[PDB]
Design an enzyme around this catalytic site. Structure first.
Site, PDB file in Angstrom:
ATOM      1  N   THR A   9      -6.250   7.216   7.257  1.00 21.05           N
ATOM      2  CA  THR A   9      -6.685   7.366   5.855  1.00 21.05           C
ATOM      3  C   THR A   9      -6.648   6.059   5.105  1.00 21.05           C
ATOM      4  OG1 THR A   9      -4.570   7.971   4.895  1.00 21.05           O
ATOM      5  CG2 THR A   9      -5.878   9.778   5.830  1.00 21.05           C
ATOM      6  N   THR A  10      -6.249   4.979   5.740  1.00 22.05           N
ATOM      7  CA  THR A  10      -6.345   3.606   5.192  1.00 22.05           C
ATOM      8  C   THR A  10      -7.179   2.789   6.144  1.00 22.05           C
ATOM      9  OG1 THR A  10      -4.240   3.086   6.311  1.00 22.05           O
ATOM     10  CG2 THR A  10      -4.136   3.671   4.014  1.00 22.05           C
ATOM     11  N   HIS A  28       5.436   7.189   6.336  1.00 17.46           N
ATOM     12  CA  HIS A  28       5.206   6.717   4.976  1.00 17.46           C
ATOM     13  C   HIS A  28       4.709   7.883   4.148  1.00 17.46           C
ATOM     14  CE1 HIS A  28       1.335   6.553   6.995  1.00 17.46           C
ATOM     15  NE2 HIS A  28       0.837   6.977   5.778  1.00 17.46           N
ATOM     16  N   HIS A  52       2.191   9.103   0.539  1.00 18.15           N
ATOM     17  CA  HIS A  52       1.194   8.886  -0.504  1.00 18.15           C
ATOM     18  C   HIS A  52       1.614   9.728  -1.710  1.00 18.15           C
ATOM     19  CE1 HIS A  52      -1.539   7.184   2.539  1.00 18.15           C
ATOM     20  NE2 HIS A  52      -0.885   8.034   3.307  1.00 18.15           N
ATOM     21  N   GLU A 101      -3.130  13.577   0.009  1.00 18.72           N
ATOM     22  CA  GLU A 101      -4.435  13.208   0.596  1.00 18.72           C
ATOM     23  C   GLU A 101      -5.163  14.459   1.051  1.00 18.72           C
ATOM     24  OE1 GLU A 101      -3.680   9.836   3.300  1.00 18.72           O
ATOM     25  OE2 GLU A 101      -4.389   8.739   1.525  1.00 18.72           O
ATOM     26  N   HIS A 112       3.410  11.283   5.982  1.00 19.14           N
ATOM     27  CA  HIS A 112       2.734  11.105   7.263  1.00 19.14           C
ATOM     28  C   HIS A 112       3.703  10.496   8.280  1.00 19.14           C
ATOM     29  CE1 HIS A 112      -1.353  10.888   5.097  1.00 19.14           C
ATOM     30  NE2 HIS A 112      -0.952  12.120   5.277  1.00 19.14           N
ATOM     31  N   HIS A 118       0.851  -1.239   0.000  1.00 17.19           N
ATOM     32  CA  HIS A 118       0.000   0.000   0.000  1.00 17.19           C
ATOM     33  C   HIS A 118       0.868   1.263   0.000  1.00 17.19           C
ATOM     34  CE1 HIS A 118      -3.278  -2.676   0.979  1.00 17.19           C
ATOM     35  NE2 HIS A 118      -2.706  -3.013   2.115  1.00 17.19           N
TER      36      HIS A 118
HETATM   37 ZN    ZN Z   1      -0.763   8.015   5.375  1.00 19.23          ZN
END
Ligand code: ZN
Ligand code: IR
Length: 256
Positions: free
Chosen positions: A195-196, A91, A93, A103, A116, A61
């Protein structure tokens, strides 16, 4: 079996994770005109001098840079927060193109990527307990724009070749996350969620106003990662972002 594709992406998540349609979901659009200065906040205390990075993992992911969180080595305090939050991982995005990937958005602007840095409230003893609490996590979010290279990122970029596919990890010791911060700690803050999946409503979000700049070559290397496992059909790890969710009954506060 959630992911970011047409068949398993964010529009499907609510079927396994009904809180996807909840009252405090993340990310959100930050309307910079509606956000109110809160003169009562405090400066963010980002204390990363003793941070101990251990490992980098492709989890199918994103990739996570993991830290030793067995003691108060890298912590976030102050700002909207009560008490001490320990860094567990960071991590990113990112997008297929430089015009998408973040995001959170700022007046509907999408950045090329978003970092993040995830921290858990030490009053709950472990991360798994913290995510069950409305004040369990504090996530520092940092936008990435494409321009000049970020020297503090290159050690991450350098290792991605070794974790191309889902389930691969590499030793990643002695990484200093201070090299990922911008100059200013001005921020917006609001109460939200992971957010996941599982999308738990346990996060105090702290989103820095100043983006960091990374090079086109640095982001292109993110986009060479794979969502798939070794020896499976290649699916490039791109567009691993959840879009903005309804703000509902929330206020975004500005530190500045
Ligand atoms: Zn994140
Ligand atoms: Ir499937």
């Amino acid at each position: 079996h959630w992911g970011y594709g047409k068949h398993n992406g964010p529009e499907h998540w609510h079927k396994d994770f009904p809180i996807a349609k909840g009252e405090r979901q993340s990310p959100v659009d930050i309307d910079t005109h509606t956000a109110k200065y809160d003169p009562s906040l405090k400066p963010l205390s980002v204390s990363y001098d003793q941070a101990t990075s251990l490992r980098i993992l492709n989890n199918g992911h994103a990739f996570n840079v993991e830290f030793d969180d067995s003691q108060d080595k890298a912590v976030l305090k102050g700002g909207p927060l009560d008490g001490t939050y320990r860094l567990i991982q960071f991590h990113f995005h990112w997008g297929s193109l430089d015009g998408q990937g973040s995001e959170h958005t700022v007046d509907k602007k999408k950045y090329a990527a978003e970092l993040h840095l995830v921290h858990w409230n030490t009053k709950y003893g472990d991360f798994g307990k913290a995510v069950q609490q409305p004040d369990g996590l504090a996530v520092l979010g940092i936008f990435l724009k494409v321009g000049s290279a970020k020297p503090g990122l290159q050690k991450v970029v350098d290792v991605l070749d070794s974790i191309k596919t889902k389930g691969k990890s590499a030793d990643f010791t002695n990484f200093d996350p201070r090299g990922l911060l911008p100059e200013s700690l001005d921020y917006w803050t609001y109460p939200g969620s992971l957010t996941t999946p599982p999308l738990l409503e346990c996060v105090t979000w702290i989103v820095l106003k100043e983006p960091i700049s990374v090079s086109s070559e640095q982001v292109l290397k993110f986009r060479k990662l794979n969502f798939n496992g070794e020896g499976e059909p290649e699916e490039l790890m791109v567009d691993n972002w959840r879009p903005a969710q309804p703000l509902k009954n929330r206020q975004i506060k500005a530190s500045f």
